[PDB]
Write a protein that holds these residues in place. Structure first.
Motif, PDB file in Angstrom:
ATOM      1  N   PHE G  32      16.637   7.186  -8.662  1.00  0.00           N
ATOM      2  CA  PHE G  32      16.108   5.919  -9.095  1.00  0.00           C
ATOM      3  C   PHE G  32      14.667   5.906  -9.521  1.00  0.00           C
ATOM      4  O   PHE G  32      14.305   5.176 -10.440  1.00  0.00           O
ATOM      5  CB  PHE G  32      16.475   4.829  -8.107  1.00  0.00           C
ATOM      6  N   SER G  33      13.852   6.752  -8.909  1.00  0.00           N
ATOM      7  CA  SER G  33      12.465   6.828  -9.327  1.00  0.00           C
ATOM      8  C   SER G  33      12.488   7.360 -10.758  1.00  0.00           C
ATOM      9  O   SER G  33      11.960   6.720 -11.666  1.00  0.00           O
ATOM     10  CB  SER G  33      11.697   7.791  -8.450  1.00  0.00           C
ATOM     11  N   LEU G  35      14.860   7.430 -12.888  1.00  0.00           N
ATOM     12  CA  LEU G  35      15.489   6.427 -13.719  1.00  0.00           C
ATOM     13  C   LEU G  35      14.531   5.337 -14.164  1.00  0.00           C
ATOM     14  O   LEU G  35      14.448   4.990 -15.346  1.00  0.00           O
ATOM     15  CB  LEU G  35      16.640   5.787 -12.969  1.00  0.00           C
ATOM     16  N   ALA G  36      13.792   4.795 -13.214  1.00  0.00           N
ATOM     17  CA  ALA G  36      12.887   3.724 -13.563  1.00  0.00           C
ATOM     18  C   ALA G  36      11.753   4.188 -14.461  1.00  0.00           C
ATOM     19  O   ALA G  36      11.409   3.485 -15.410  1.00  0.00           O
ATOM     20  CB  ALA G  36      12.376   3.039 -12.321  1.00  0.00           C
ATOM     21  N   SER G  37      11.225   5.385 -14.201  1.00  0.00           N
ATOM     22  CA  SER G  37      10.128   5.956 -14.990  1.00  0.00           C
ATOM     23  C   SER G  37      10.574   6.285 -16.394  1.00  0.00           C
ATOM     24  O   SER G  37       9.746   6.416 -17.274  1.00  0.00           O
ATOM     25  CB  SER G  37       9.619   7.246 -14.366  1.00  0.00           C
ATOM     26  N   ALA G  39      12.346   4.367 -18.312  1.00  0.00           N
ATOM     27  CA  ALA G  39      12.586   3.154 -19.085  1.00  0.00           C
ATOM     28  C   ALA G  39      11.751   3.080 -20.337  1.00  0.00           C
ATOM     29  O   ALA G  39      10.587   3.478 -20.337  1.00  0.00           O
ATOM     30  CB  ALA G  39      12.361   1.919 -18.235  1.00  0.00           C
ATOM     31  N   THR G  41       9.479   1.588 -22.870  1.00  0.00           N
ATOM     32  CA  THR G  41       8.389   0.643 -22.695  1.00  0.00           C
ATOM     33  C   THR G  41       7.871   0.126 -24.008  1.00  0.00           C
ATOM     34  O   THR G  41       7.412  -1.011 -24.103  1.00  0.00           O
ATOM     35  CB  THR G  41       7.225   1.332 -21.980  1.00  0.00           C
TER      36      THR G  41
END
Lengths: 221, 191, 49, 221, 221, 49, 49
Positions: G32-33, G35-37, G39, G41
């Motif tokens: 998840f880390s 994954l979120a990074s 994204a 932008t």
């Protein structure tokens, strides 16, 4: 002689969130290896950011339908993690366990229409200070807003800014609170061509600077 | 020393003007941080109590002094003599949370409970007075608190300001004097 | 500090004992200290001692 | 074996002014930044020095009026933080919370008259030892005193010296105390020309070596 | 886990002469300077040595009178800090607060006579072992003794030696004690010429090796 | 010190345990010590041992 | 660690305080880390500011 010591009144009681550790009794246990187990997450917000979830509208649908009539206000809701529309999102699911927050909340709009259904939408953040959200794109236009049309790309993302007097805000809403303390979000439909009955899915996720502080256990048990 | 009083510019003359020697002074006892750093009793109590430093007595050393400042900041320590277990909750919590054990709950241990609590308001600083025309949708904003506590019964509540910061001093009054010259009172003396 | 006189270092970490102050850039922001130190001390005029 | 320890009788009780700290329970809270907030003060005396406040005279006015009659003693008061005249000053406001003091207290006189009102005043410190303060400038002249006239500069400041047997003095006054233990201050009016009805504002502030020691909570609660 | 500790039975009680210190509660007090205050003393014996005080004789006089008759024994007394004659001296005043002692006690004789009064005296230390002190200089002569005459110098000092089986001795006297445990001191008058009615003041002080040990609080309260 | 025999250093700071003495300028101001040490010890006159 | 703030080292050995984790080969396995990074932008398309 031995070491003199004063056992202080007021200290020593157990506190459910204390920063100590118990004394052990069953030593030397080696766990089965769990090296590289999939899907781990270490901070709630990492998932809150990566996995957006749906808002609740009308009957209880995760979308908004294009009006065939002369009304252009597709939807409106309180900028509050306690909002009715936000009640099914993972974001609110987490937020209930914290007292305050600050940061950007991101909204995602995904058009579901047919290739021949076309539309133009507008989302606006109405800060607090006004008595009632404007039902007209013309009036809302004076706020921070964005418009976008239907096309090759189905999703459009918009960030709801954190603008308030205090640096933080309550995730909960007091009963005395008349108008939502942090304002509203209004989604309008500028126009559409043969887009009757077509849908607009909207979801929400945490933004880069979204933050929750002060853990709380508030639910009835 | 004569000056233009109207300008309000500070003037501190010294006894040297007429032949004296100004001495050495040690003002540790008038240090804000130090002086506000002692326990003070909160008089009104109830099984559910929201911590508000303004419930402090207005003539008490801490209360008076606090009120002689417009804005303040501090962490806090509390001492509570209660029946049953004590549960604290941070600023901004729904009153209902006080019933739940996973919020900092201290299990009863005699004679009382002493805790260390952090500043937990959402403002950069708090105020003792707030000229709100409304402040809504001598009443101070609800957000001006240090959280709340609850127990089966709360017999005593002592509060202690840690790391105090005071800003914008305002009036601090002494006992009014009716007597022709001085306020006289019985000062301790051996028998 | 004020009214704390423990020689021995604290047992709990600082981030638990107190709230962590943050900045957006303690300092010598002591309006009143500055103010008091700026007071005219001399004597206005000519002297005849 | 384990560490022997003697829990000492007499120690451990809670003391309202103790030098310890409680055990924490709710960790990791980062406060909103309060960098450079205006008007901070760290020592009461810094403000007590910078901000002089008014004495109370007669009816309850912060000034003294020029006598049109043959009396020259404008005002007289006890050199005591518990003095009636000092009762409204911030200095006394603070002083009530301390047992003892020493140092210079400064008085400020500010003439309010018209451009054509002229006067000459005199302030004197009458140390203790005499039965009653002199009502005459001639008699007071033998004490530490200063005279000044009206002119371009409206304010005149004078320091009341600390002269006593002990190094410190009580901020409070005992009921057995007949004559003020630290003496009096007398303000005279040598003369005036067309200064009838004009005013002299007097205030007080802490001096460079003013000091308060021994905190005390004495008010009725 | 946390530190295991055994709270030991038998320890922790308060003891009036313990070597600990209480926990403080009122900090940061700076005392008025007492630099170089006169007349300080840090050890009782320093004053006990420098300031000799008087013995008590007869009616209750600090002196002895020259006998006009044929008796030569001017005075005799027990070598005991509890002696009647020593009862008014500062030395005994201190001694009562200690259980044991050892060392030299010094006696001082100061002739008060007229320029034309002349005399010759003798002091002797009669150690224990004899049934009764000799009333004759001739018999006493066999003991440690010293003789001196009247002249330009009025004072004559003599040291009573510490001679006993044990290294220390009791400052107090038990009721079973018949003869003084440490012997007697006898002052004789060998002769005199026109010295009738003249006086001999005698005082006592601590010697270089006088020592008191074991503090005691024995008086009735 | 007198009648204090703790090997271990005090837990509270000195400015709390005791009052702070000040000076205007402990020393060897022991009148009585000086006095006693100044006592004549010898023998006045001529000796014949 | 999370919610533990003791400055002083533990009195009991680690193998008693906790269970010993074993491996067959903590790491940056934070799906998840990552994954979120990862994204997006930016902004898709051309901009006209």
């Amino acid at each position: 002689g031995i070491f003199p010591v004063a056992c202080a009144d007021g200290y020593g009681g157990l506190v459910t969130t204390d920063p100590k550790t118990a004394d052990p009794v069953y030593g030397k246990v080696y766990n089965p290896p769990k090296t590289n187990y999939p899907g781990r997450f270490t901070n709630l917000l990492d998932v809150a950011e990566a996995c957006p979830t749906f808002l609740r509208f009308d009957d209880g649908k995760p979308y908004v339908v294009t009006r065939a009539d002369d009304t252009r206000l597709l939807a409106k809701f309180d900028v509050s993690l306690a909002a009715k529309h936000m009640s099914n999102t993972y974001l609110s699911g987490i937020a209930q366990y914290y007292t305050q927050y600050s940061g950007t909340i991101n909204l995602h709009f995904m058009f579901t229409g047919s290739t021949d259904s076309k539309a133009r939408y507008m989302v606006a953040y109405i800060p607090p200070g006004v008595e009632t959200p404007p039902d007209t794109p013309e009036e809302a236009a004076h706020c921070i807003h964005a418009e976008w049309d239907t096309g090759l790309n189905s999703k459009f993302t918009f960030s709801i800014p954190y603008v308030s007097a205090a640096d933080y805000a309550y995730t909960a809403s007091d009963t005395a609170e008349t108008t939502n303390v942090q304002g509203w979000v209004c989604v309008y439909q500028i126009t559409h061509g043969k887009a009757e009955n077509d849908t607009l899915l909207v979801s929400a996720s945490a933004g880069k600077d979204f933050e929750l502080r002060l853990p709380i256990d508030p639910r009835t048990q | 020393t004569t000056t233009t009083g109207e300008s309000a510019d500070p003037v501190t003359t010294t006894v040297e003007n007429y032949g004296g020697d100004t001495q050495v002074q040690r003002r540790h006892h008038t240090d804000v941080g130090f002086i506000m750093d002692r326990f003070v009793k909160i008089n009104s109590l109830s099984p559910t109590h929201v911590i508000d430093l303004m419930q402090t007595h207005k003539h008490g050393i801490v209360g008076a002094l606090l009120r002689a400042a417009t804005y303040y900041f501090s962490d806090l320590e509390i001492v509570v003599r209660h029946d049953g277990n004590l549960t604290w909750v941070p600023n901004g919590a729904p009153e209902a949370a006080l019933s739940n054990t996973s919020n900092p709950t201290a299990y009863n241990k005699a004679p009382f409970t002493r805790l260390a609590l952090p500043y937990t308001a959402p403002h950069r600083v708090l105020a003792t007075v707030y000229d709100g025309t409304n402040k809504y949708s001598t009443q101070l904003p609800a957000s001006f608190n240090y959280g709340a506590i609850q127990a089966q019964a709360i017999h005593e509540l002592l509060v202690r300001m840690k790391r105090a910061e005071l800003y914008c001093p305002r009036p601090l009054l002494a006992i009014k004097v009716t007597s022709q010259d001085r306020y006289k009172q019985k000062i301790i003396a051996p028998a | 500090s004020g009214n704390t006189g423990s020689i021995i270092n604290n047992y709990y970490m600082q981030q638990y004992q107190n709230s962590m102050s943050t900045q957006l850039g303690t300092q010598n922001n002591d309006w009143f200290s500055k103010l008091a130190s700026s007071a005219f001390t001399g004597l206005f005029g000519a002297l005849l001692a």
